Amino acid sequence: ETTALVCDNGSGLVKAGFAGDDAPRAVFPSIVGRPRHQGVMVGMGQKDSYVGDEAQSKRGILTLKYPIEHGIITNWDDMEKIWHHTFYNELRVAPEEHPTLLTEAPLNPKANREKMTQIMFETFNVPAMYVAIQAVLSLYASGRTTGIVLDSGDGVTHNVPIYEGYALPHAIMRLDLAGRDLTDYLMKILTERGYSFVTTAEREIVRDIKEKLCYVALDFENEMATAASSSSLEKSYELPDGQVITIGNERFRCPETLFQPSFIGMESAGIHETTYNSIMKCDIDIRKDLYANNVMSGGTTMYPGIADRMQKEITALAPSTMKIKIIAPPERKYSVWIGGSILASLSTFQQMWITKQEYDEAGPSIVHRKCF
Amino acid sequence: FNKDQLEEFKEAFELFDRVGDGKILYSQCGDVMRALGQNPTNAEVLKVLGNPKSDELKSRRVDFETFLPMLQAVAKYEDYLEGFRVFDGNGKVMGAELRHVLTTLGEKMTEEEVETVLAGHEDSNGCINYEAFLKHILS
Amino acid sequence: WXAXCPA
Amino acid sequence: ELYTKYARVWIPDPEEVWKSAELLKDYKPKVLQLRLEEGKDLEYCLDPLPPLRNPDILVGENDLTALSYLHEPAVLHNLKVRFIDSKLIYTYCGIVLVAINPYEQLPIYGEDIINAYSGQNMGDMDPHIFAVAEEAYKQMARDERNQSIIVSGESGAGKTVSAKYAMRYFATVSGSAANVEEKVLASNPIMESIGNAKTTRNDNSSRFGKYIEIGFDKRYRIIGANMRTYLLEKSRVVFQAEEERNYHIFYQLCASAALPEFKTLRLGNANYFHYTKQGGSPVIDGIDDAKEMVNTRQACTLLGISDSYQMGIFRILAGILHLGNVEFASRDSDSCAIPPKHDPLTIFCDLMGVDYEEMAHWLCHRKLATATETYIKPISKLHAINARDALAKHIYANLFNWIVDHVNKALHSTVKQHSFIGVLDIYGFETFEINSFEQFCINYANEKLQQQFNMHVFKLEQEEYMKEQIPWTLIDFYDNQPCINLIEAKMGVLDLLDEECKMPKGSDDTWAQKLYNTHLNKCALFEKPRLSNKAFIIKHFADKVEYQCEGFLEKNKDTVYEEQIKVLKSSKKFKLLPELFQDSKEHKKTVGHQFRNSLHLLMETLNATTPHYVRCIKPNDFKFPFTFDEKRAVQQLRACGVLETIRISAAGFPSRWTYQEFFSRYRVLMKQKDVLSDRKQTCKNVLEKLILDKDKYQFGKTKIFFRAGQVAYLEKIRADKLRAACIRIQKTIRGWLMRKKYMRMRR
Ligand SMILES: Nc1ncnc2c1ncn2[C@@H]1O[C@H](COP(=O)(O)OP(=O)(O)O)[C@@H](O)[C@H]1O
Ligand SMILES: [Mg+2]
């Protein structure tokens, strides 16, 4: 049989591969670079614009645009280059051969799915397509049918409660703290130690300091006092040129804004109170099963200690007879793709695809009809 | 039947009376009919006798007067030839096959009856001219 | 987005 | 109708499936007066007719299609009479040969008879296994196309004896000197020790299809066989129902634990190990496993597996047993660990030559890797047990495939094989009181084979009809593809099983619910047992079978965590264990999907070929010589498809008579006027009078074809005419003779 593609556009990373594989063939940043200087040599083989691992490699010469921000596609002429690169160069497969499965954050604009569909049928000419809510796939991946899922990538965060495969749409919370806003905060705070980062090609440096050095405090105000009093906490990192920077009590302040969005001036509650408020919107027969199955998902949940901090600060809110368990598997950065990999391989699913014969009759609005 | 016929039949009946009481058995009625020129089957004989049971067939006795209606009922060649041509097609019939069918099918006869009637009618090959044997047995 | 935010 | 007085009829009876009766008074359109063998009238009632009986000339004929009424009691009668009173153990049905196992040696296999069959045509002789072997051996010469003999039945039936004589025939008619017969026969004890099991209902059931390809050179001198095996039932290695066993080799091995060379295997008694205690039936009465062992080792040595490899094999099987005792402790609902210095694992690592800490790590964790990054992830105690049991099934299936390659090395010959004749030995259709995934697989395989058989028979009938110039539209083709599509096709019972293995928290209950949702009213062949939500019924070719859902999923599942293989491949103590794993999705495939593929390889092997079929039936459960239990034999005949074959044949024109032999038989009904010089026209006239509906017969160039029933009708009207003639003649001779006695009394 022709196996279907699974392509988790996410934001910031593209994860793609064939259904039934256990990890993606292709993981590269969803980034489009255009050169900004004047090219001076002649015969160089200059190229208009670079996608993904090229734009990461050459980044000092380029301006880097992310075409997706907060799970909304904001530039279609960029985005279509990224898909084109995914099918033809990175997987090296013509998408006209076999179906494609795509993933989206819940509750985002209705027109985004219509454009995805229109591009998949019109240009790539895919035989069939589907779009799937990311947080549903994280349950298929973690092997559960009852869960509440804190799914938090670059771009977007959301909670979806699912009980025995019935989703509870009235209780879906979405929040716009994400890896990109921890990164932009980490830029504005490193300036206190004098380091400065003003360009996209070095926003991509701060994004990697954040990945290696940062961690989340089990209780904030005592580590804030400790590392203000003892320098023992600070660690150092080599910039690309060989300059050494040093980061101290700062390196836990940026991931901790997930729990206090007040630090960047958002009103809304952190991920713990939105998780709990999402459980409270569910009806009381199921709350005990949601409290047991809290599933972390997506990359922004990778910070060391985010599991134990969640279990602490939800146990501070839940009734003390309940039992609270945070399930944070080590793969979790990929669990949305792994979940889409099993979903697309189920024989029961083969009916579910939006086939081209349906789309040509009903038009792109068919998604709202036949998808979730 | 006229008086002469009735007298001849009664006389024949009395020749078969082996007890002197002027009567025969049910089982002899057929025998008398055959003695009087009839050729009824055992089935036909039992039918005209009223399908008697073994006990009355062997010991119940009837006089000529009771026999007569039965004789009447019983009284009331090309098929015979085709019947013999069944067992042929050179106009002969094996003695073994005729013996087997007469002793094993239909109202089976004894081998001795068949030997008696067949004595002298088959040649050295063991073939019977059945048209001549038939004319002989029908006279 | 289209209103309440930049996307 | 013609249920007349002295029509015989069969009546159903509890003790012997049918009894003869005689219709004591004519039928007329509620209850019949029937004279029985036991008593002159006992009476039988007709429900909102009894099967009529064949005339005495037809019963005992060499070929069951020669019967005019084709149905269970007449078949059962012909096999019973031919077997019991004439001691003919071989009979023909259509193409099939039916071999009734006598449990007794017989003179019929001698070399003079071998000569008597050589060069004959098939119908020229009373049936014998040599007449199938000869038909194959000539067709291989007459045509390029290669040939197969397919042998089907229960394992008790004596399929091995059929294959033995089919090879002896090939050797003798080839005039060949070499020594293949001896070696192929000497392979049987190892193939039976590894591949053969004690089931609830049979001892030494064979749980795989064995294909022996007898190779011939360009001159049809023999060249020596290649052995293949298919359809092995891997799940038996790790699970048994009540009073089953797994493969004999484990019990033979455990019985030998006292022998000096097995000291280091540290074996127990057979109920000490988790992979053998589950059936609760360690001993078969009448077998010494301790002694069957020695015949296995002798068979190995005759095939020249060195003594070093024999101790390698038994080292691996002790490995598998000790592996199964390894008992995980749950750390957490989502993680497990093996406790410290756990003893079964110690002895397993000592046996297999691997570092204890690597096996202890990799059994309890699994490795994900993307090209850039890799994660070691813990697994549940359930998944740890499924992984261990998948590894044991993989070590076993490879060891089996390796032993068969050493057999092939001893049996191959260097000469270039020009063509071959295959002998396929396979199990029949299977049905038990409690009915489970092992049977579901066996019955699927038998559906595929019965489809091939129906293809073949239908094709040869279209050839025979075009030889005789009869329109093809009259032969109807009966097709079981709607049943195979219920199983193997997409959304079939297998596809929804594999789809349930990987959907989260799948269970046999929710599998059953998917079955009902998908098929229950939508399909003619799937039904739900009225009183349960945990079973389903498939109307198979031969019968309805009820399968119980409990525990397919645990049997269905293989995933070998590749890092556990990669630990074992690293072993350096002994040669064999690295040898096993010489050359992925292959590890990911479930047991059912492997079986489905192995069956496709089998069918594409047989489809390359011209089949010839044998069926073996077991006459009695107690091995009494030459006794024939109707109650057993009916079940064996249903399981071999002989009866549904005959039901399909009775729809056609079963009864085929040559014009001259017909004319010979029925001139008795023919007036001497009416016989012409033209035989074909004479019979066309007569029969068109005797049977007014032309739909009952066809006039082939050479033969009359009659539908089922009409030859019995002709025999009845012949007997009635012949009887009426005899009555007329004999009454005339009686009345003559007593008329002469009257003339004597007048004298
Ligand atoms: N190991 C890590 N630790 C902390 N943050 C990470 C890590 N890996 C990725 N991130 C951040 O999270 C985002 C990537 O999350 P991911 O789940 O891959 O996004 P998406 O699924 O939306 O494509 C980026 O902002 C990246 O900076
Ligand atoms: Mg994501």
Author numbering:
A (entry chain C): 4 to 375
B (entry chain B): 4 to 79, 86 to 97, 100 to 150
C (entry chain H): 1 to 7
D (entry chain A): 5 to 33, 36 to 54, 59 to 187, 190 to 595, 629 to 792
Q: What are the paper's exact sentences on this?
A:
By using the actin cytoskeleton as tracks, myosin also powers cellular cargo transport processes and can serve as a molecular anchor and force sensor. The myosin motor domain consists of four subdomains: the actin-binding upper and lower 50 kDa (U50 and L50) domains, which are separated by the central actin-binding cleft, the N-terminal domain, and the converter domain, containing the long α-helical extension known as the lever arm. The active site of myosin is located at the interface of the U50 domain and the N-terminal domain and is allosterically coupled to both the actin-binding interface and the lever arm. This coupling ultimately enables the amplification of small rearrangements at the active site to large, force-producing conformational changes of the lever arm.
The structure of the actomyosin-V complex in the absence of any nucleotide in myosin represents the rigor state. In addition to an unoccupied and open active site, the actin-binding cleft is closed, facilitating strong binding to F-actin, and the lever arm adopts a post-powerstroke orientation. While the actomyosin interface of the rigor state of myosin-V is basically indistinguishable from the one in the strong-ADP state, the lever arm orientations of the two states differ by ~9°, in agreement with a previously reported rotation of 9.5°. As the strong-ADP and rigor state represent sequential states within the myosin motor cycle, a comparison of the respective high-resolution structures allows the detailed description of the structural transition of myosin-V upon Mg2+-ADP release. In addition to the ~9° lever arm rotation described above, the two sequential states differ primarily in their conformation of the central transducer β-sheet and the N-terminal domain, which twist and rotate, respectively. By promoting a piston movement of the HF helix, twisting of the transducer increases the distance between the P-loop and switch I, thereby opening the active site. In this way, small changes in the active site (~1–2 Å) are amplified into significant rotations of the N-terminal and converter domain, eventually leading to a lever arm swing of ~9° upon Mg2+-ADP release. A comparison of the three states of the actomyosin-V complex (strong-ADP, rigor, and PRT state) reveals a striking similarity of the actomyosin interface.
